[PDB]
Amino acid sequence: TDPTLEWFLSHCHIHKYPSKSTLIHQGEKAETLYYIVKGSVAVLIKDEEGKEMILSYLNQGDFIGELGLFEEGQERSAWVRAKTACEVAEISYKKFRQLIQVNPDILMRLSAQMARRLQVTSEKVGNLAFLDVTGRIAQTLLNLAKQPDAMTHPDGMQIKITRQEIGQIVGCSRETVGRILKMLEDQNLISAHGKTIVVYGTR
Amino acid sequence: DPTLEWFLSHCHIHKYPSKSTLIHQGEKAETLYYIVKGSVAVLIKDEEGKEMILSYLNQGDFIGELGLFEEGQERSAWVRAKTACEVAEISYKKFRQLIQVNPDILMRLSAQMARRLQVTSEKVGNLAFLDVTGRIAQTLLNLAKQPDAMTHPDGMQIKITRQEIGQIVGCSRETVGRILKMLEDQNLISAHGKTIVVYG
DNA sequence: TTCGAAAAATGCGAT
DNA sequence: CTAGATCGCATTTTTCGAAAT
DNA sequence: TTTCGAAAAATGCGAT
DNA sequence: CTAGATCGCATTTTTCGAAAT
Ligand SMILES: Nc1ncnc2c1ncn2[C@@H]1O[C@@H]2COP(=O)(O)O[C@H]2[C@H]1O
Ligand SMILES: Nc1ncnc2c1ncn2[C@@H]1O[C@@H]2COP(=O)(O)O[C@H]2[C@H]1O
Ligand SMILES: Nc1ncnc2c1ncn2[C@@H]1O[C@@H]2COP(=O)(O)O[C@H]2[C@H]1O
Ligand SMILES: Nc1ncnc2c1ncn2[C@@H]1O[C@@H]2COP(=O)(O)O[C@H]2[C@H]1O
């Protein structure tokens, strides 16, 4: 932390959420902004039957609930769920705008994050439009294997995730994921036992 | 609109005829665009050349903003003119200088990125949750309620090819063709050539 | 580090 | 022709809270 | 400112 | 099973720019 973060937080209300809890409900009126002090969350949307699609994972340093800031009468566009325990700062849009008046760098930071999220989401549209499930899963496994929470392994990198969650990322049933992971292992591209998956030749 | 006039006085104005390329995907991003007149399409292509439309943008919209917040970024997509366009262009360097004297310019830009993220997230949901028939129906209906839609005694009228609908929903032109025939069979639309009447 | 539920995840497979 | 979604249960595998170290 | 005949672009095939 | 992608071309629309009154 530094004097700027402390200055910012002194204008916020800090709350702690346990793993699996819901921070933002899709459809509710948006009047506040959040800043992740510690922890990680998953951004998701769902269909009429409850099927879920994960749009993104966010971490400490990331703002959340920002899309309603620029125009009143807006509703939350997605659900945000705590992936681990989280410490989150909350502030009304009304007061956040006053803070921008005294220190506009805060808007620059928020804007940069939205820009990155738009590039990532546009790429997802492409993957879904141009790639079959095998290609989407293959790319998703390589991407996770290169994140900072991924563990090293003599044959490449190791990650821990369920077939169901992979299905929520790539847009397919958990059964299809399971059948493809076995084919990938037969082709000796990976090794998977339980939630532990080893991605080979990532190095 | 003092700021708007102030902003434009620092830009270079260019014109692009319909179908021309304003932004090439993969090239280095160093300049920001602002549409003064006309409309464009933002699209991505696969290795085989198939295309997918991410969005249509119109007068008042910024373009090429994604490479501004990080160094060494490349254009994330192609931008092609749909109609003849009049566009204001300014370097990232100079734009940053304008942000300093009046950060409200960044506010208007951020507001558009916020809306584009909401829209693109909705598109992800549609691609993952709806079959082609459902995606085509929603698209026909949204197009029919846009300002450029024509009045018709049976509802609203639009003009578009089966190939373009295919680039919007992510399916082959042949599939769009078969689905439009089935939707006509259900009396939801009437299609002759590029002209489609959405009953209402 | 440990151990026994509790609860979560997984395999099924011809249409 | 090629890809995938389904569905009800019985089995695995993982998580969790408190003892044991 | 209407009309018209190419080029160009778009569409149907439809069992596999 | 249900949903969609494919391919080689002849045929059906659209788009255009030049010619007229
Ligand atoms: N097209 C899709 N088909 C099936 N499940 C999907 C799809 N898109 C997203 N999902 C979600 O991904 C999840 C993967 O595990 P489940 O089969 O339990 O439930 C699935 C849905 O919630
Ligand atoms: N595509 C996305 N990528 C990343 N974060 C998103 C995306 N869509 C929505 N969000 C976040 O989820 C939040 C849900 O509530 P808001 O709409 O207020 O603000 C949204 C963003 O912070
Ligand atoms: N899954 C897809 N299958 C086919 N075409 C697609 C797909 N996704 C995007 N497209 C594009 O949309 C276009 C629709 O018409 P075409 O079949 O001529 O060419 C198609 C591609 O350029
Ligand atoms: N999902 C999207 N919705 C709207 N506009 C987009 C989207 N993705 C990219 N763009 C625009 O297309 C531009 C391509 O170049 P840039 O990446 O510089 O900036 C991008 C945005 O201005």
Atom of ligand 4 nearest to the CA of B68: 18
DSSP B82: S
What fold, for B1-130?
A: Jelly Rolls (2.60.120)
Residue of chain B whose Cα is closest to the Cα of A123: B76
Rounded Cα gap, residues B12 and B6, in angstroms: 13
Euclidean distance between CA atoms B155 and B197, whole angstroms? 7
Residue A121 CA, nucleotide C9 C1', distance (Å): 28
- Please give the CATH architecture assigned to the domain spanning B131-200: Orthogonal Bundle (1.10)
Among all strands, which nt has the closest C1' to B171 (CA)?
A: F4
Out of B69, B121, B170, name the one closest to residue A111 (CB).
Answer: B69
Exposed/middle/buried for residue A145 (C-beta within 10 Å: 0-12, 13-18, 19+): buried
Contact A45 B121 (CB under 8 A): yes
Radius of gyration of chain B (CA): 19
Domain spans of chain A, in order of start: 1-131, 132-203
Residue nearest to ligand 2 atom 14, measured at CA: A78
- Our CA angle for B49, A126, A170, nearest 5°, is 135
The reported resolution of this PDB entry, expressed in Å, is 2.1
Q: How many CA atoms lie within 13 A of A29 on its CB side?
A: 5
User: Residue B54 annotated as binding?
Assistant: yes
Amino acid at A16: K
Note the helical H segments in chain A.
Answer: 3-9, 93-102, 105-130, 133-145, 163-170, 174-186
Q: Which nucleotide's C1' atom has the smallest distance to the CA of A180? A: D4
Sheet holding A52-59, edge to edge: A22-24, A79-82, A40-46, A52-59
Fill in the amino acid letter for A61: G
Domain range A132-203, CATH architecture = Orthogonal Bundle (1.10)
The one-letter amino acid at B87 = V
Chain A hits for B114, CB-CB cut-off 8 Å, are 66-67, 69-70, 114
Considering only CB atoms, which residues of chain B are within 8 Å of chain A? 44, 46, 50, 52, 54, 65-66, 68-70, 76-77, 99, 103, 106-107, 109-111, 113-118, 120-125, 127-129, 170
E strand residue ranges, A6-73 = 13-17, 22-24, 32-38, 40-46, 52-59, 63-64
Using what technique was this structure determined?
X-ray
Collapsing DSSP to helix, strand or coil, B13 comes out as: strand
What beta strand segments (E) does chain B contain? Answer: 12-16, 21-23, 31-37, 39-45, 51-58, 62-63, 78-81, 85-91, 150-152, 155-159, 189-192, 195-199
Superfamily (CATH H level) for A1-131 = Jelly Rolls (2.60.120.10)
How far does the centroid of ligand 1 lie from the alpha carbon of residue A137, in Å?
13
